[PDB]
Amino acid sequence: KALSAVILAAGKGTRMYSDLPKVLHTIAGKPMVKHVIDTAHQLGSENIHLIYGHGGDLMRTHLANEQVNWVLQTEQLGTAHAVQQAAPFFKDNENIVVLYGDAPLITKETLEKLIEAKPENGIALLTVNLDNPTGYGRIIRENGNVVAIVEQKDANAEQLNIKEVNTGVMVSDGASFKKWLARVGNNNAQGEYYLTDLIALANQDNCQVVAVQATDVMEVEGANNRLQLAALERYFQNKQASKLLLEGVMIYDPARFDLRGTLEHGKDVEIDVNVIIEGNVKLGDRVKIGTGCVLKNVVIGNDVEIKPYSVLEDSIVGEKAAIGPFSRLRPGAELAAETHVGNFVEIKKSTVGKGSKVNHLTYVGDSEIGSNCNIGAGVITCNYDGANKFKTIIGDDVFVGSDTQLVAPVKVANGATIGAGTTITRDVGENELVITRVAQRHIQGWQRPI
């Protein structure tokens, strides 16, 4: 049967001390609530009812493309009241899973188990065992059935020893939610309608409440401040790193590795310490990434070595290429197979053909460079003062001497040779040699001021 989700995401997150609302703070570069939205979608949720409130304007702007139902909460009256704002949109015959926008690490797998355990017209409740359950709602079972959730201040000495606690995550059908939520009262010290009461109400109607235990407590932990968020970040990164290690990615130190997006990898990929992978990154076979590198939205072909302290974004690198150390590829850099980009080199929105080398102290922007070119040290592509940024076209088999200024728009045809210290403003023809004629003054017997 069908499934929909309700995600609670209205909290201010005061102890974040931020202008952002609580759930927009990120884990692995992705807002906490977006983790939960994605998980809900992976589960095959038909609708996703997002209960929002504080920072509502920023929620709308940051999540504008999410396929969610925008249910605004104007007052905090507990979890049952929040969920009831979404309940008119529940289908009687679909399951509803309740989730929390500030508890981002809940997994599809745990939720599949939970959903499978839900007995007809009953509830599946997610629980977890804690060594010190102090302050959490104790799960009371009679026989092997869950009958109630007893809060810390209500529990007796025998109940306080119960290690199994309530996580707040539960599954029931829509009809049962609409029915039971209407029977929830708020006659308590907080004056709030509590979702925990659905466990009692279910048993009241001779409906079964089954418990499923979470794999890791971190799946159900919420982040109330940046310290707690950092702990979730580290647990998540370790989990990501472990998965990649077991798939055969050699990550030299998984405690010094960060993935903030998605990584597709070949075999025998080696990643040294302090690498950051962002957005969508694809690495071919036998790719070696040196220490300190940052790759954001890149495709790296087989057998490429990226040496230390290289920063790449929105770029493509062909097989057997060599990048770094201290290389900068900015958006639109496309390096063909067997290319060489060296230290203190910046490539922006340019194509560099097979076998070409750009090895020192160079800026190439808005350029097309052909195959087997030699781009000498200190070469700079530049523009005239004025408007837009025009293109430099360099053909195949061109030698560009060190410190050459290539002033766009300009074309250098196949097989040209440009001497060092040249300023190229006019097009260079095929097999044309251009060398700068220098005027120098020579003074003999000049004694230095030393």
Add this chain to the structure above:
Amino acid sequence: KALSAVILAAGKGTRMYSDLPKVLHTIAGKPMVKHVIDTAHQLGSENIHLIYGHGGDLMRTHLANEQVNWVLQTEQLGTAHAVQQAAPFFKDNENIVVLYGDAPLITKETLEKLIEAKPENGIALLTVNLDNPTGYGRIIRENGNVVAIVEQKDANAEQLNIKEVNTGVMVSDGASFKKWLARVGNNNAQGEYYLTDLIALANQDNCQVVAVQATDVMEVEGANNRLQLAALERYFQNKQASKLLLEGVMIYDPARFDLRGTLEHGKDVEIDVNVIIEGNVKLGDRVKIGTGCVLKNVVIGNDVEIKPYSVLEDSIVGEKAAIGPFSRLRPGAELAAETHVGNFVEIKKSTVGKGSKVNHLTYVGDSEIGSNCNIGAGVITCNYDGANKFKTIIGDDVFVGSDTQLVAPVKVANGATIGAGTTITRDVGENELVITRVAQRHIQGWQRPI
């Protein structure tokens, strides 16, 4: 009543295998003893009696500006003998707190509690509970009063089970210190006068000895070698990081963050992994610091992004500025609001006006650059061979073409335009265009040696 401190700092620290004396080794960039001196001052200590000895010459040079009384120890005869060298300078009616120069993490807060617990004419003793107290002096209480400190080799089976141990830190009044220290003997296996005997002597005179427990054992741990020092460093950095996280600084990985000095911050500040903050650093609201950055003595305005692998020192950065990646700001760099400093750029002792850009492969030193200038790639400010380093003055709205050499002293007035590859030795006037006339030799049909 008044307070003064005695800090023991005479040890050689042989297992450091260093030419430095023990207490000059640093935690968070600050000598261990300086941590303790500062804490003593935070407590409002009137005098700080520093017992020193080994590496005395280096102690004097490194701590020359500290407001301490320099009490030289010529021989090791135990803690009571060390403290007695300072005792002639104790005021009868002030409290005296005893501290250790190689135990740097003792907190003001713990010491306030200790000082408050000191009963009139009595002693307040700092204690700590250990799971394995083996080798530490056991605290013996009778009723709820501390009566003795029993050393490991003296303790009976029942006493060896006591988990509460002596840390060595204590508070008493000056009169009581002068009195009891004179009654301490050295008839023991080390032949040393022990400060622990003051607990007995106090009870002997019907004076009360009250115990206060330290928060963390790391407050009372001493560093005897670099391994132990590293452990103190890591605990201290984690504590610093946690505080900042709870104040709302987003530190992506607190295990990969270092603060060596002081940080003042706005809201929504983000600090990526492997950042080092040194000296006095001020960050405004919404500052983003990328991976690998080093900031030493800097002021960074609101909304500034510092991209990866940038190194900044003794610099000021205005709001909405953009720095990095691979940017170097050396002392005296002053960047106005909305400026742009890019990769492989070095700025030294220069002012850069609002909206100006210095984006590639450039050295600017001893310069004033105005507002809305375009400093092209490969631009270098330089001097003539000889003496001092003179100034380059660039006005507002100037375009400096790529690879221009600006030879100081020189001035370029408002609205000037300088073509690429130019050497500027003479002043440039307002709205003056200077372009380099090149001589080139063109040879057609030059077949490259390929």
Add this chain to the structure above:
Amino acid sequence: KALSAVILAAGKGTRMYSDLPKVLHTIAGKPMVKHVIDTAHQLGSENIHLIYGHGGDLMRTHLANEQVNWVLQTEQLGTAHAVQQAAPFFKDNENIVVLYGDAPLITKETLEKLIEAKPENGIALLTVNLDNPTGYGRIIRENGNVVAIVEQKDANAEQLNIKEVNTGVMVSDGASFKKWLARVGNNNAQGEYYLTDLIALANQDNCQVVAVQATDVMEVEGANNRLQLAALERYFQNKQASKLLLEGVMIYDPARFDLRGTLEHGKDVEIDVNVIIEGNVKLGDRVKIGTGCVLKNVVIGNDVEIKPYSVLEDSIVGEKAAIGPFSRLRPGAELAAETHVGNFVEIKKSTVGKGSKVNHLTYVGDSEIGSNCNIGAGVITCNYDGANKFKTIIGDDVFVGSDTQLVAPVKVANGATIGAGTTITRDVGENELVITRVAQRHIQGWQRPI
């Protein structure tokens, strides 16, 4: 008496998901089996019998210079069968130690203890205590003698409580190995000949089997996948870091330090976070290494400071030199005492004499630079288009102006002065001043397009 080793190294390591065989994956930059080969050699092994199989071709190429006996295994029939392939080469009167190529952290010291404990005509067995010994062969002692090793599936309730387990490492004499290995059978669920049976067989012949316990369980752990390998890497690096810390090297964070080879150090050496030391590195007294540096095969003299994000390889640095930040020394860089190499500078296969400075945005390759030279910003040594890479010779006391192109082969003699923006193609004589005569067009009242 003599000693030889047998190392089992035939496994495929399927869960590495690699084209490499299991034991060629590295710890600290060195293949796992090479760790074990070296340890065996440190113990004074006369022969080293390497049992190999999967990835045999790659084993031969990667380990071609190892002094090992190449014993090929064509089928897996257990540890006793593997060892028996080597047994014809055992000398009757030498000890034989059995080791595993995928258990790289076994120490010489532990193995010395093991070898000393071996009773005449008996076996010394390496054991370890585990809190949870589930799945490991339990060591059964009668009196205080080891009589058997009982496997998990065979053990009774009382035996399952035994915490002491078999590591697989053992020592016996060659005659005893040849004898007992021939009596090992394979009538078991795997159909394999097990080395564990030698413990029974020894007791059968009234020979004593003595047990020695490993220091750390990590000495006997094998790496079956990259996750487990990473754990061995981290344990090994921490152990290396701890040793250096206790020798008096100040390593600011040992969890962010990597040694992949050997380090020789002086006193008062300081190493900041995220440094990587590779190959053979020698650091003199008071060397300071800043954050992010990479040193591979370098010799660094006394009092040298290497500032952040510098990468050095196959280089020599004289005393009191200053390198970085953002410096690149490539193979064959030789810097004399009191030299200065600054940001965005690349030095390759060049000698730089005493007191000389190369401080910005510079490439020096295949060069000899004398003493007290000033190599200005933007200076580039380059070649003509064509064949080999020729040399630039710069004498003592030379000033090379910013942006100078030095076109090899060329010589600049003692005391020469070269103005900024010069292209040097012809030799420069002693005390010769060369300055570039520029042609510039000046246009007044040029209004910029702004």
